[PDB]
Amino acid sequence: EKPQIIAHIQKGFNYTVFDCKWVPCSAKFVTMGNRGTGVIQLYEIQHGDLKLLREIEKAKPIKCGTFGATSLQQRYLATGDFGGNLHIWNLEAPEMPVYSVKGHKEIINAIDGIGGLGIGEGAPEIVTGSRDGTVKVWDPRQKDDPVANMEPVQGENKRDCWTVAFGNAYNQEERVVCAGYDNGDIKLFDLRNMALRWETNIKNGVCSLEFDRKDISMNKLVATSLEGKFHVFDMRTQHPTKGFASVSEKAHKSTVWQVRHLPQNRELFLTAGGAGGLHLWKYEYPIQRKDSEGIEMGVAGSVSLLQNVTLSTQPISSLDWSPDKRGLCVCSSFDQTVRVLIVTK
Numbered sequence: 001e002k003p004q005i006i007a008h009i010q011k012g013f014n015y016t017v018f019d020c021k022w023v024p025c026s027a028k029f030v031t032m033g034n035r036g037t038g039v040i041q042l043y044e045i046q047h048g049d050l051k052l053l054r055e056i057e058k059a060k061p062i063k064c065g066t067f068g069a070t071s072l073q074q075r076y077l078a079t080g081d082f083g084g085n086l087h088i089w090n091l092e093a094p095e096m097p098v099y100s101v102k103g104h105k106e107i108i109n110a111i112d113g114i115g116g117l118g119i120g121e122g123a124p125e126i127v128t129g130s131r132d133g134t135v136k137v138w139d140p141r142q143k144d145d146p147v148a149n150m151e152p153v154q155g156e157n158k159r160d161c162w163t164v165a166f167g168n169a170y171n172q173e174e175r176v177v178c179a180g181y182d183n184g185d186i187k188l189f190d191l192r193n194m195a196l197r198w199e200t201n202i203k204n205g206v207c208s209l210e211f212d213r214k215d216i217s218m219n220k221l222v223a224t225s226l227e228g229k230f231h232v233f234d235m236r237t238q239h240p241t242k243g244f245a246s247v248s249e250k251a252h253k254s255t256v257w258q259v260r261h262l263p264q265n266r267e268l269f270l271t272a273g274g275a276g277g278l279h280l281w282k283y284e285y286p287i288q289r290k291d292s293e294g295i296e297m298g299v300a301g302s303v304s305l306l307q308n309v310t311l312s313t314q315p316i317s318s319l320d321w322s323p324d325k326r327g328l329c330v331c332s333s334f335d336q337t338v339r340v341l342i343v344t345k
Contacts, residue, residue, distance in 0.1 A: 001345070005278055005309050009340035011050045015039055019064045019318045020332040023075060023091075024117050028053070029320070029330050030077055030091070031338055034061030038081055042091055045340065056094045060085070068113025068166070068214075069124040069140060078126045078140075080108025086128050088140060099140050106131035110164045112177075117323075120169035120215045127166060127177050133158025135179045137191060150177065150189050159183050167211035167235075168218045178221060180206025186223055200243055202231060208258045211235070212266040212283075220283060222269065224256035230271060234289055237298035242291070245298030251279050251305075260319045264326045270343075272319050272331060276312025279305055280343065311339065 017033040027045040032038070038058035044051050058081070065079040070088075076098055077089045084104035087097040108128045115124035125147070126138045137148035152158065160182040168176040175191045182205045188198040204226040212220040218235035221244075225231070228251045233244040254274025262268040271279045281303045291297050314334035322328035327343040 002307050003280060003343055003345040005280060005307055005311075006342045006344065007311055007339055008342045009045065009048070009050055011043070011052075011338050013041065013336050013338060015336065016061070016334070017318075017332045017336065017338065018062065020330050020338060021065055021067055021077075021320045022322050022324070022330060024067050024070075024323055025072060025075075026324070029338075030065065031332055032062035032065050032077075032079060034082075036061070038062040040065075040077065040079070040089070040091075040094070043338070050338075050340070054091065056089075056091075058087075059083075063108055064111045066111050066113040066126065067117065068119070069116040069126045070113065071116055071124075078111060078113055080104075080111045080128050080130075082107045084108055084130060084132065086111075086126065086138065088126075099143070101138070101144060103128055103136055103138065103146065104130035104132050104134065109160070109162050112164050112166045114166035114169050114175070114214055120166070120175075122169060122172045122175060125166075125175075127164045129161035129164035129179055131160050133161060133181075135161055135164055135177060135189075137177065148177075148189075148191055148194065150179065150187070150194075159185060163206055163209045165209040165211055165221075166214050167221070169215045170217055174217075176218065178209050178211070180209045180223060184225070198238060198243055202229070204229065207256060210259050210261060210269075212261045212269075219266065222259040222261075224259050224271060226255050228252040228254060228256055228273065230256050230259060232283060232300075232303060234298035234300060236289055237296055239291065239295055239297040242297055245300040247300040247302060249281075249303050252277050255315065257315055257317050258319050260321055260329075262326075263321050263323050270319060270321075270329070272316035274315050276310045276314060276316055276333065276335075277308060278311060278316060278319075278331070278341075279308040282306055311341075312337065 088099035134151040136146040252273035
């Protein structure tokens with residue numbers, strides 16, 4: 001018996017929206033995008049309806065945001081905009097940012113936060129991934145300079161970073177950043193001692209990366225790509241030269257824009273595709289997760305499609321499951337609609 005993906009509530013917006021996130025411990029969410037100027041908009045679910053509470057114009061279009069580094073008492077939105085600025089915002093008083101750095105030379109494409117909201121050990125950090133080809137890690141207590149910078153050696157060419165994801169944050173010294181690029185590069189950096197723990201290439205642009213849960217020893221990692229392709233890597237077993245076992249799926253014919261694991265269940269995940277398609281997958285682990293030479297390597301499992309609907313005219317470019325209420329989900333589209341979905345069962 002199949003879960004149902006129900007369009008519960010929706011609202012038209014009149015600009016471009018590039019990202020959306022639930023405001024933690026609330027019935028609220030933000031959207032962000034772009035006159036050519038930037039905007040964040042704050043919504044709340046009210047009498048089963050959607051009330052626009054606020055809108056915040058900024059100088060430059062906003063590409064992505066995250067609450068993942070903020071506290072309950074602050075709930076500040078960290079954003080990456082089109083001129084390479086990273087801002088932290090008090091939504092209640094957003095005229096001036098709490099934190100401001102021109103971190104990057106081009107659009108910040110992607111952003112993640114860990115350590116805030118009691119998720120992840122260690123001080124709170126934000127990771128930004130840019131069109132300038134660099135990935136930087138920021139501690140909001142240190143103005144101006146990042147605490148880590150992952151970029152090619154000076155003689156090597158820059159690519160375009162499309163996606164960044166925190167993982168492995170189970171204690172104060174353990175923490176990785178997985179980054180994805182326009183040429184299909186996936187690079188996994190260990191932040192404890194700056195190490196390039198693993199690198200691969202998936203042929204096409206890595207549109208989105210997400211670990212199955214952020215604050216546990218790396219379990220699964222999903223990468224999504226052009227041509228309806230996504231990959232699920234078992235992260236528990238690395239062969240030093242062969243890497244991590246994986247299974248690919250062709251979900252749609254179109255670009256797979258985003259993967260989001262259910263916060264309440266790490267084996268469940270949604271993909272959002274190029275044509276407004278949402279597919280809901282569950283991973284199945286093989287009986288046992290050594291090679292010819294007696295060196296360990298992972299064993300890839302399978303994914304089974306649970307449900308799929310087409311809910312938009314345009315790409316569904318961003319998605320966020322509710323941390324507060326299981327199966328509640330928000331997504332944004334290039335048709336200029338935000339949708340509140342309920343996922344049953």
